[PDB]
Enzyme design. Structure first.
Site, PDB file in Angstrom:
ATOM      1  N   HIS A  41      -6.564   8.460 -11.531  1.00  0.00           N
ATOM      2  CA  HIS A  41      -7.912   8.226 -10.817  1.00  0.00           C
ATOM      3  C   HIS A  41      -9.024   9.343 -10.756  1.00  0.00           C
ATOM      4  CE1 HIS A  41      -5.948   9.400  -7.328  1.00  0.00           C
ATOM      5  NE2 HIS A  41      -6.658  10.112  -6.847  1.00  0.00           N
ATOM      6  N   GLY A 143      -8.210  15.585  -1.497  1.00  0.00           N
ATOM      7  CA  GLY A 143      -7.806  16.597  -2.540  1.00  0.00           C
ATOM      8  C   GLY A 143      -6.475  17.007  -2.730  1.00  0.00           C
ATOM      9  N   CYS A 145      -4.149  14.730  -3.855  1.00  0.00           N
ATOM     10  CA  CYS A 145      -3.675  14.055  -4.857  1.00  0.00           C
ATOM     11  C   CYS A 145      -3.219  14.911  -6.008  1.00  0.00           C
ATOM     12  CB  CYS A 145      -4.845  13.225  -5.513  1.00  0.00           C
ATOM     13  SG  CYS A 145      -5.071  11.875  -4.347  1.00  0.00           S
TER      14      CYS A 145
HETATM   15  C1  LIG Z   1      -6.567  12.227  -3.614  1.00  0.00           C
HETATM   16  O1  LIG Z   1      -6.623  13.541  -3.250  1.00  0.00           O
HETATM   17  C2  LIG Z   1      -6.851  11.365  -2.280  1.00  0.00           C
HETATM   18  C3  LIG Z   1      -5.663  11.596  -1.279  1.00  0.00           C
HETATM   19  C4  LIG Z   1      -5.983  10.681  -0.046  1.00  0.00           C
HETATM   20  C5  LIG Z   1      -7.097  11.112   0.775  1.00  0.00           C
HETATM   21  C6  LIG Z   1      -6.665  10.828   2.129  1.00  0.00           C
HETATM   22  N1  LIG Z   1      -5.253  10.921   2.013  1.00  0.00           N
HETATM   23  C7  LIG Z   1      -4.777  10.858   1.000  1.00  0.00           C
HETATM   24  O2  LIG Z   1      -3.602  11.061   0.608  1.00  0.00           O
HETATM   25  N2  LIG Z   1      -6.853   9.978  -2.850  1.00  0.00           N
HETATM   26  C8  LIG Z   1      -7.936   9.058  -2.760  1.00  0.00           C
HETATM   27  O3  LIG Z   1      -8.841   9.617  -1.786  1.00  0.00           O
HETATM   28  C9  LIG Z   1      -7.657   7.766  -3.176  1.00  0.00           C
HETATM   29  C10 LIG Z   1      -8.625   7.556  -4.369  1.00  0.00           C
HETATM   30  C11 LIG Z   1      -8.343   6.636  -5.406  1.00  0.00           C
HETATM   31  C12 LIG Z   1      -9.687   6.565  -6.078  1.00  0.00           C
HETATM   32  C13 LIG Z   1      -9.735   4.992  -6.831  1.00  0.00           C
HETATM   33  C14 LIG Z   1      -8.443   4.538  -7.411  1.00  0.00           C
HETATM   34  C15 LIG Z   1      -7.234   4.573  -6.299  1.00  0.00           C
HETATM   35  C16 LIG Z   1      -7.535   5.442  -5.045  1.00  0.00           C
HETATM   36  N3  LIG Z   1      -8.265   6.997  -2.043  1.00  0.00           N
HETATM   37  C17 LIG Z   1      -7.469   6.349  -1.144  1.00  0.00           C
HETATM   38  O4  LIG Z   1      -6.216   6.862  -0.816  1.00  0.00           O
HETATM   39  C18 LIG Z   1      -7.803   5.773  -0.092  1.00  0.00           C
HETATM   40  N4  LIG Z   1      -7.204   4.642   0.276  1.00  0.00           N
HETATM   41  C19 LIG Z   1      -7.029   3.408  -0.649  1.00  0.00           C
HETATM   42  O5  LIG Z   1      -7.906   3.254  -1.445  1.00  0.00           O
HETATM   43  O6  LIG Z   1      -5.879   2.306  -0.514  1.00  0.00           O
HETATM   44  C20 LIG Z   1      -5.812   1.105  -0.716  1.00  0.00           C
HETATM   45  C21 LIG Z   1      -6.768   0.400  -0.087  1.00  0.00           C
HETATM   46  C22 LIG Z   1      -7.969   0.128  -1.066  1.00  0.00           C
HETATM   47  C23 LIG Z   1      -9.153  -0.775  -0.478  1.00  0.00           C
HETATM   48  C24 LIG Z   1      -9.174  -1.102   0.915  1.00  0.00           C
HETATM   49  C25 LIG Z   1      -8.043  -0.761   1.934  1.00  0.00           C
HETATM   50 CL1  LIG Z   1      -7.969  -1.057   3.332  1.00  0.00          CL
HETATM   51  C26 LIG Z   1      -6.917  -0.076   1.309  1.00  0.00           C
HETATM   52  C27 LIG Z   1      -8.218   6.220   1.331  1.00  0.00           C
HETATM   53  C28 LIG Z   1      -8.694   5.189   2.192  1.00  0.00           C
HETATM   54  C29 LIG Z   1      -9.094   7.630   1.110  1.00  0.00           C
END
Ligand SMILES: *[C@H](O)[C@H](C[C@@H]1CCNC1=O)NC(=O)[C@H](CC1CCCCC1)NC(=O)[C@@H](NC(=O)OCc1cccc(Cl)c1)C(C)C
Ligand SMILES: *[C@H](O)[C@H](C[C@@H]1CCNC1=O)NC(=O)[C@H](CC1CCCCC1)NC(=O)[C@@H](NC(=O)OCc1cccc(Cl)c1)C(C)C
Lengths: 306, 306
Positions: A41, A143, A145
């Site tokens: 991603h 950050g 990830c």
């Molecule tokens: C990467 O460094 C980052 C790490 C997280 C941020 C906060 N804590 C972490 O561990 N990862 C992300 O920000 C991801 C981004 C990618 C981009 C698109 C592909 C998949 C995710 N985003 C998340 O982790 C978000 N969570 C999430 O999308 O979980 C499933 C979801 C989706 C839609 C709606 C819901 Cl309610 C849940 C976080 C909310 C930031």
């Protein structure tokens, strides 16, 4: 004596962390030989996250779209491929700090160390378990990830986890190092939830053996129990089933303490039924389930790595 | 999000661990530039431990009595001296892996990472606090002496602890890196006991701010309290006094959560008076006191090191 939530020494992995930047996204990658591994991603944009088709996001990129920092040195990408949910960036330089390593896909209940990283720089190390619902209860901010989870076996680093995302309950989901998610999760920002978790029964028993090794015996008792009758109690308290295989694995600990596995099970039963009643075990007022039998033996006998 | 007992990345310290052997005694030493630091009881014999006079044990040794292994390489001792309770062995080779470092003597309540080592090889890393009674609740077996405790500040390793001995309650005692014991302990196998420990109140408050940062709010309340009235409650429950200085240190956390320090104190009061009543905070059923305010801010904002 003493018993701590112990992580593996992290130096072998610190030498492999790099920064990967694509567009407006910065995250961590793992640099082993001439390849940098990172979550796919990283190629997503802010508008691209509800249902991305990664096979292009990728077909549209060129190598020079990938900015890789190994500290004060930029690494040049000379190729890229996608394997499941991880990118592999071929770079022109092999990591001279590359340890002996393996990629392993672990079973739920197994533990590992996580080196949390931001911008390619390690922030801290801690010990995690793969929960039965295939989340990990981590500590991760934006950050982080691409931070990886790992075990060390003598001189070999077994990488087992790379971080991808945070679920709404504040727990974490990611992949093995070949890009396959643990659990049913997908890398798209759509509705997903962890599923019901359970307690790792074989690990609780191992931690009770750790307690006995270390002088806490207040929770032992007369009784024994059968596997069946124990598992009937476990199921009510949302504990994983104990298998005969778990019992055999608990053999060395049983033999070193002189407490038959099934006797320790009788003790855990009464702990579940009566609680701890103001007393602690190994400094904990809860039954701890993130030490495997192997962790206990490792820490209580002093195994090293080189 | 998430909150874990986080240790510093250990690689900078792993590169400094060596094995020191004298007579029938093997332990760990810390190799920085051309000096190896280790506990002075390495020169004691099995009959020598009730009331040793180290100033000879040492005047009787020659350099060639000290066997130092840096992995697959023997280091030659070209000089030795004693500083308080640590030996300093001058060797003919400077450690090329020597990080930027400082020796610091920490205050009780401060936390640090311990790299547990046997035979010069790291075994694990975990996070400790200096207890108010100047013990640490470690995890240490025979051979772990000379393992060190440390903090990292950007690129600099601040060494603060080296391991010497285990007290009868299973807790641990040692020195700063200039050989001064923490607490009243001495390196002689005579009657010694830890003294009454207390809970590190400022750290408990910091961990409650960590909880709020991470979404646990069930323990908050209306009330406020004065410092005096809080400290009257703390003293009954064997908690350290909270000073105005602690309050100021808790300022950033107070400001980031919008909960005045004295309001968080009112919450801790009710937690002490009513217990937790079957609920947990950050996965703990006890009030945790081994995170400093700085640890909380570091982990909840993502500070790295390079
Ligand atoms: C990467 O460094 C980052 C790490 C997280 C941020 C906060 N804590 C972490 O561990 N990862 C992300 O920000 C991801 C981004 C990618 C981009 C698109 C592909 C998949 C995710 N985003 C998340 O982790 C978000 N969570 C999430 O999308 O979980 C499933 C979801 C989706 C839609 C709606 C819901 Cl309610 C849940 C976080 C909310 C930031
Ligand atoms: C060094 O690797 C080792 C590490 C400990 C072993 C078990 N866990 C440890 O942390 N240290 C020792 O073995 C020391 C040896 C020196 C040698 C003489 C100078 C001082 C100690 N020994 C101990 O830690 C013992 N504890 C101890 O002596 O504590 C004070 C004491 C003295 C007399 C009587 C009592 Cl009841 C208490 C342990 C009992 C091994």
């Amino acid at each position: 004596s003493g018993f701590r939530k112990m992580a593996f020494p992290s130096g072998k992995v610190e030498g492999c962390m790099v920064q990967v930047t694509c567009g407006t996204t910065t995250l961590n990658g793992l640099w082993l030989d001439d390849v940098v591994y990172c979550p796919r991603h990283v190629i997503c944009t802010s508008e691209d996250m509800l249902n991305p088709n990664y096979e292009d996001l990728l077909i549209r990129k060129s190598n020079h779209n990938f900015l890789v920092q190994a500290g004060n040195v930029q690494l040049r990408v000379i190729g890229h491929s996608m394997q499941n949910c991880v990118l592999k960036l071929k770079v022109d330089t092999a990591n001279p700090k590359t340890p002996k390593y393996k990629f392993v896909r672990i079973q739920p209940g197994q533990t590992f160390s996580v080196l949390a990283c931001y911008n390619g720089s390690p922030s801290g190390v801690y010990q995690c378990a793969m929960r039965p619902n295939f989340t990990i209860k981590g500590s991760f901010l934006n950050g982080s990830c691409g931070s990886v989870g790992f075990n060390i076996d003598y001189d070999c680093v077994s990488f087992c986890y790379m971080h991808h995302m945070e679920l709404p309950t504040g727990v974490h989901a990611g992949t093995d190092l070949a890009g396959n998610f643990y659990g049913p999760f997908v890398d798209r920002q759509t509705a997903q939830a962890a599923g019901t978790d359970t307690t790792i029964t074989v690990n609780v028993l191992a931690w009770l053996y750790a307690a006995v090794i270390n002088g806490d015996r207040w929770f032992l008792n007369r009784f024994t129990t059968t596997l069946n009758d124990f598992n009937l109690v476990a199921m009510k308290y949302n504990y994983e089933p104990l298998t005969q295989d778990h019992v055999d694995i608990l053999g060395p600990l049983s033999a070193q303490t002189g407490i038959a596995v099934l006797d320790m099970c009788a003790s855990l039963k009464e702990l579940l039924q009566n609680g701890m009643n103001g007393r602690t075990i190994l400094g904990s007022a809860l039954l701890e389930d993130e030490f495997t039998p192997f962790d206990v033996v490792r820490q209580c006998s002093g195994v090293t790595f080189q």
